[model samples]
Target: NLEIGKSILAAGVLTNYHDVGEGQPVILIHGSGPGVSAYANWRLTIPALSKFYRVIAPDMVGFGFTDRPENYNYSKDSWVDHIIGIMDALEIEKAHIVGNAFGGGLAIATALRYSERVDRMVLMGAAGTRFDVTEGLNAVWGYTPSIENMRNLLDIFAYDRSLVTDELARLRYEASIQPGFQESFSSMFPEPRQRWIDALASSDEDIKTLPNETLIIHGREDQVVPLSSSLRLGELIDRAQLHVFGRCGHWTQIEQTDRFNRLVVEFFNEA
Candidate 1:
């Protein structure tokens, strides 16, 4: 059984998360996918990081083991609010955020809307900047949850086909089949176009003014979010630094785990 913890948010939503280690707080926000969860996304990196910083990887509101309210309306604002609620329930005054893909976008939204609660951020293959959707992205939001489809999706996520293990695909397949999982996924992103539009929480104008020190990491060959998004983010944020990994795809932290972890730890430890 997966070890999970739950907290009731101020909005009466029951949030599920993985809370581990001790020290300065670090929030790990996961991306959006048919079966994507905080554990699925950050399991490899969390343990190492938890050695130096407190790591809280939440399943957001509508994904993973978190409760999905039938009437809940999904929006960029809702995700940001849910994250803040998690922080409040945990009594985390401020934290360094590490967001992956959609989670990266959430981190940007949180910093833009609630700068007081954010200390720093690491956006890996993050989505938020405005950009036209690509074929790989279409495959992502267009998933219908079959073993074949899961395998195909995993193919687009990593640069090396060898990394797309049978066990990984099987686990994702199982998660996708959970009751109400697809409904919640669809509700969060009802319309494809609107999903991209809502992701544009911070324009170049807004990113230019963001005060948090940010690190933007992307795969040179990212198929989902596009490398240009991170490139543009690096240009817009005054204190943003960009790191590109060659022969990698959208899953930066996984494709390049050790390097990604080292970079994150070093960046956060900086003065």
Candidate 2:
């Protein structure tokens, strides 16, 4: 396991991240969930990708070990700035971006805002494009911390129920209950709000202008963001390729670790 370290961004927010290997930089961004961190999400794939590229996975402003200040406003622009700040701190002028769920939306926003900084992108079950909230998303954002609820959320996250191990559930349950954690999570993804107003919901017009070579990966069985989200992204992005995995759910990286790693690494390597 790689040790977590803090990088002070230009804005003075302390960002926690994993920096390992040496090659072209690849920034991995985690999605939003109870106790979701970059380490938790990319533990399996980072080592594999690091062999070929420098991998930097950070816990965004509100998630994981990063600073979750009470006064901090959670928005897509804030996330984009936070990520760019990390890159500036690390002195990386450009990198390939890989984002899952909410992170996917961040990747798109970053590309849209700072196209010069992004070399390529891989969005897995990404949540930027506008779509109706599905049962899986409702379960995630509406969850009240409990072992049973965590297990149920995990069950919804994967196509295979057996993957929702008791140990994993316990770890996530503990992470969700951390001090000030729920407040930050809830503020970023408040319910009863219009999707169009949410930063996560990007319109087709927003995606149509992205110039990066993009890969949109989603599970056919994903009930969270829906496979249609990826399809729309594929249609909109000029150079985007879409890949849908069957018998998988929202957790595409976990449910199909080996295949997901291979696909993403291959995509990043493409000329």
Candidate 3:
């Protein structure tokens, strides 16, 4: 329930903001999906990270308590602009960014477009590295011929079906019924293009230019984003440090917050 500033009045742009601590700035970006909020995903990590850094976690446009405009296009570049806008509103010159899943993709987009504004980057289970198709994910949100099939496919995004609690599932099901729900979903998950060349091109352009202190953390058993994806990113970015957590899944930070926090502190201290 933290508001950073006046509303942007932009379609689908909600800026639920939170701030803590008083040192170097750090921003947390959540992944994309129905009912996905920055705070919901990052609640456990922000307070700890904030102890040593000024942490800012905003519910991006189209998610959480923020406004969800029907006309907004949730493209990667557009998301980057939204984040920069948040930083501008807060008068943050630069920050160390931690992004998860689609949020991780936004972090890469921001670093690419606003390199000078980012001091360091942490990507966990990040998307947009290469074009990947998870049948489980596609089944859930896929543009299949049948609606029921699409819902079935979407269920695959998580390993434990029980994790999709009744309340959360109800909320997500409601969000899926919104007017532009499919459009926003499609924007994030585009159909196959002539070549994944353009996708690879965008990734190469960004990953190669990241600062020296980049960190790549991944779950060895990550079901959403393959461990290979993180390996590829590590190879692409110069001096990128890779840490693979055993028996962990896509939600690494959430599943292992304490160990994750310790790893982050050690890494930041090393740098």
Candidate 4:
């Protein structure tokens, strides 16, 4: 088994998620790469973060093992609501959010719209800003699912090429092709994808006014999303700190697993 993890009703959908450890709640938000899942995206960080906090990483409505409603509308508003639903279903009044890449954009939207439900935020390689779209972003969104494609993509995600192995590729490939995975993924980021990135972005004024204490982490070598975006976030967010990991890529959580997870706990510890 892939050991997909726990389930719950988040916004009327049977959401797949992982819950472990104890203490103040921490929500780990995953990215929107092809064949991405909360489990796959946050696999390395979950256990470590769980040691110090009650970590909840849910598969957002259209991703992972979550049931994708045929009539469900996809938008930043709907996506943020799904997160709010998870907190409500779990009875968490407010929680810290750790958002990666596209998930980071949702974190911004949620904090901006539902300030009461969000305690603090950590955005890594987040995509909640309008910036130059690169080939890496285009290739991932326009993924032509296959072993080769997945492996090629993996290489682009990590600074250390040695981490991209055949076994990992096979695993990510299988995850990407799960039932309904590609179908929903394909339409989410269609042609002329720049608009989609802009859609995920919050206006500078909106971001500037965010009240939540924030941490912006980015890999210096991230090819999928520009590091400049995080720099923009660092400058714009009112109560924010920025940290850049050298020799890392888009997969900051995996590429620098220990440091990434440890930094999150430290950031949340002071909160």
lDDT for each candidate structure: 0.86, 0.86, 0.68, 0.91
Candidate 3 lDDT at 98 equals 88
Clash totals for all candidate models: 0, 0, 6, 0
Error of 4 at 268 (Å): 0.5
Better of 2 and 3 by TM-score: 2
The positional error of residue 65 in candidate 4, measured at the CA in angstroms, is 0.3
- The whole-model C-alpha lDDT of candidate 1 against the native structure comes to 0.86
lDDT of 4 at 55: 95
| Candidate numbers sorted by lDDT from highest down | 4, 2, 1, 3
Which scores better on TM-score, 2 or 4? 4
lDDT tens digits by residue: candidate 2, 59-170: 9998887888768888888889999999998999999999999899999999989999999999999978878777778889878899999999998898998889999899
TM-score of 3: 0.80
lDDT of 4 by residue, 1-271 (tens): 4438888988888999989989999998899977788888887888888888999999988888888999677788899999999999999999999999999999999999999999999999999999988999998999977999999899889899999999999988988898889989887889999989999999999999998889999999999999999999999998899999999999888888889888889999998
C-alpha lDDT (0 to 100) for residue 129 of candidate 4: 97
Clashes of 1: 0
| Alpha-carbon deviation at 228 in model 4, angstroms | 0.5
**Per-residue lDDT tens digits of candidate 3, residues 143-167?**
4223343244334444445565656
